Design a protein around this ligand. Sequence first.
Ligand SMILES: [Mg+2]
Ligand SMILES: [Mg+2]
Ligand SMILES: [Mg+2]
Ligand SMILES: [Mg+2]
Ligand SMILES: [Mg+2]
Ligand SMILES: [Mg+2]
Ligand SMILES: [Mg+2]
Ligand SMILES: [Mg+2]
Ligand SMILES: [Mg+2]
Ligand SMILES: [Mg+2]
Ligand SMILES: [Mg+2]
Ligand SMILES: [Mg+2]
Ligand SMILES: [Mg+2]
Ligand SMILES: [Mg+2]
Ligand SMILES: [Mg+2]
Ligand SMILES: [Mg+2]
Ligand SMILES: [Mg+2]
Ligand SMILES: [Mg+2]
Ligand SMILES: [Mg+2]
Ligand SMILES: [Mg+2]
Lengths: 210, 147, 203, 46, 102, 52
Amino acid sequence: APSRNGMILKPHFHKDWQRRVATWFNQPARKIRRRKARQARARRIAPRPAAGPIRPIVRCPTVRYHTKVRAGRGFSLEELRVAGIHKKVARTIGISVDPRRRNKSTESLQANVQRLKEYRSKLVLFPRKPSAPKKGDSSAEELKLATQLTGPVMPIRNVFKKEKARVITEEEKNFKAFASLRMARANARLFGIRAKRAKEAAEQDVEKKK
Amino acid sequence: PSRLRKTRKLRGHVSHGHGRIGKHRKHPGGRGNAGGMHHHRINFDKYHPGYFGKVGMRHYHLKRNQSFCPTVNLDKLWTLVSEQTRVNAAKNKTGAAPIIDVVRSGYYKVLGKGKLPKQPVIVKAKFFSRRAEEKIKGVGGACVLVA
Amino acid sequence: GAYKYIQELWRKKQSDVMRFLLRVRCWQYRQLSALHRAPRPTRPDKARRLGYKAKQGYVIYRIRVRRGGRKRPVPKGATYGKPVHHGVNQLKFARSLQSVAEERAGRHCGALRVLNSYWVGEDSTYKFFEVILIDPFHKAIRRNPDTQWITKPVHKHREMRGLTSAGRKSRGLGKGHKFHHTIGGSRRAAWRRRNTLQLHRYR
Amino acid sequence: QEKKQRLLARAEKKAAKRPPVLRAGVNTVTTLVENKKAQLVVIAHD
Amino acid sequence: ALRYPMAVGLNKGHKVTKNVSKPRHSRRRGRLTKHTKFVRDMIREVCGFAPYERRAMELLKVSKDKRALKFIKKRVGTHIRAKRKREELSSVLAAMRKAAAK
Amino acid sequence: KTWRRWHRRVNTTQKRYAICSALAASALPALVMSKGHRIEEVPELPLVVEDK
RNA sequence: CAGUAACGGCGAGUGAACAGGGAAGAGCCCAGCGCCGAAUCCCCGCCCCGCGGCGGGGCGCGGGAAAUGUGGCGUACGGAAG
RNA sequence: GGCGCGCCGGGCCCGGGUCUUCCCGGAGUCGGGUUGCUUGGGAAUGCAGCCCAAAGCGGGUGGUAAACUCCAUCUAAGGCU
Ligand SMILES: [Mg+2]
Ligand SMILES: [Mg+2]
Ligand SMILES: [Mg+2]
Ligand SMILES: [Mg+2]
Ligand SMILES: [Mg+2]
Ligand SMILES: [Mg+2]
Ligand SMILES: [Mg+2]
Ligand SMILES: [Mg+2]
Ligand SMILES: [Mg+2]
Ligand SMILES: [Mg+2]
Ligand SMILES: [Mg+2]
Ligand SMILES: [Mg+2]
Ligand SMILES: [Mg+2]
Ligand SMILES: [Mg+2]
Ligand SMILES: [Mg+2]
Ligand SMILES: [Mg+2]
Ligand SMILES: [Mg+2]
Ligand SMILES: [Mg+2]
Ligand SMILES: [Mg+2]
Ligand SMILES: [Mg+2]
């Protein structure tokens, strides 16, 4: 029974919703539960990073988001085999791996390759038994100053290049951008139909010439 | 607060603010906004014209990411880049022009709403409107594309 | 190996070799009773690729589900209700007859656990399924690490929670855009996340 | 028990050739046929 | 002129140096190995054909190919599968014609 | 019911406005005696001590 | 994301998903293809040890299971052999 | 109880890179038709009954049915966590 003027609306309460209402009164108890669990995990893996492994440079999928770079799932096998880290040794020394990632580009692969080689220059790997080091172990001086780092290991930020104040060329001042966009729109929409009309013109051409 | 509300001053009034001829019955006009076509016709036509019926094509799987192209204007095109570039490109007698990369600021399409100050630029967008391009050319300065 | 040959043989079913075989098998199974122990699988390759490693502790049953749809178990006509819910004759049941087969075999053997199940034969009025059972208290099973998972209490009666292949195919799950109405644990977990108010503290 | 006598003989010999055999089982038999190392194949009828 | 990388058009997109990697080893599933080809035509020489296949081979022998194709697509399903099975039965029937020739 | 809206939120800048007004009203000697704290013999009102 | 795309005597009403930010984060294994003298497993008896989660070792011309296929390598990120 | 140390016995005598030669897959299941239920899923999203019922440069997905044709992306019909 609506009155004079006001938005007509459809509240989704026609079901019996009072038997199922999730109330958030354990929000701070759940946060202190999670951070006590996080402190226990971070002190039970004692020199290792609390954030877990390292996760690669990854560009977001869709048109809204492809200019932003975020942390991905794991390093792909192709940048692992370029960085020389073995498939089953990467996650055991702390490098996350998913095999499902492709690498369709080259420069993102080389960014992940340089990021892995930076990680291997940065990590301090302890000998397995302390009384007997091996060839792939760090030196006992930097073993003394090893410690955890908080937050995500080598944080991933989308740094932007900065291009200086150019003096403008007259080719750029005679570039007609709106006509170029609409002309490319029209060519892309009409690519196929012009091709089949060229095909029909070719077949009537060979009919008129043969 | 219930201390400030109405029902603290409707005690002792034998109908509690809902009349005595027409009592406060439960649901007299149907539940919700029922009776659109039938008996609330003139509310829905004096106050929500357009409400009944279909118009336009059905699009089964819409993705706002595909339809994403947010706009900026030539008024606020200089807002994106700090004041030091403006005052340096005003003091700068060499004709060098700053680059305004609108995409990293987060706007894909430059539309041209208002007056742009007479100061050269390289506006670097993903789309352009015709009037925005003509105003940047009329200031003297170029419109480059990035995808 | 032979199992590639006999699996191509079982894929050729309208070939008259296999038509004679499954017709005589279906006759024999129709004569024999509803729930009897098969001593060894009729289809060893499919038994092995479903999990039957022929050692001590795996048994195989051969059970007969009665073929057909499901008419609504209601007195004579008379579903007392609105005319959407009148029809009783052409209703169909949500689980496959393979799942019903492994269900009643795993019910008849309460001590044993359904691994998987497969097909052997059919006629117009019955279908026949051989279901693989594992004895979880036998020590050739219990001392083998890659199959002592069946000996845990969470895997109690897989066939009735619907966790095998035949029960799994009737819950409507799997990755994709085809299975939006089950994300969460299951179909009801999907429904239950969707139809609750998350009334926060601060709203 | 013949293999146990053979292996104890070999173990005491090392602490001090392969004869040809039948090859049973339908998988070994059919891979020997399709790799063509069989000289004849006996097949049970039942 | 100037060909800036445009967001629209037939050659749209941010230009990138496409690497050439080997295809992943999941992509070759169903690429017919010659051993499985041998197993499969051995099994077909054991067991023969289906009844709908025999009637389809007979319609290809009489050569009414349109009703043959409609027959396979009604008794198998998709028209792509029907084209494939008609072409395979024509190949089998051609092998029978060559064997019956000599 | 339990799902009464118990908890209320207020904006960060006016939370900080209120914390600044509470500090700045603890520096006028009238508004401290007005709250009632007997400070008639305190040597100076924004009363600071050694960090010892 | 969204009370959106969408369903609905298109009426009342119903109504997801992707992408993004977070919590957490861990991956793996068979059958098949194969190659290794079934290289595998269960149970009884005796001796030693421990035994309130009946296990470790040896001895058995001890019994079974298993070639209608157990174990070792090996699984789509390929893998094996030389 | 766990994290620590040492002794006895047992088990395993293991890896990586390059070249060459081989090998590779789950069927009354997929899919199609029809019926019924369900889903926001709309020329049928999922589920099931009946019938038809495959293939291997194959098969599925690619939110309008269908044919031709490029592509894209995965590998179902087995299992643990
Ligand atoms: Mg009123
Ligand atoms: Mg009054
Ligand atoms: Mg009254
Ligand atoms: Mg009234
Ligand atoms: Mg009246
Ligand atoms: Mg009322
Ligand atoms: Mg009327
Ligand atoms: Mg009704
Ligand atoms: Mg599970
Ligand atoms: Mg199905
Ligand atoms: Mg909104
Ligand atoms: Mg109407
Ligand atoms: Mg997401
Ligand atoms: Mg985190
Ligand atoms: Mg084996
Ligand atoms: Mg139902
Ligand atoms: Mg409905
Ligand atoms: Mg197409
Ligand atoms: Mg699998
Ligand atoms: Mg799987």
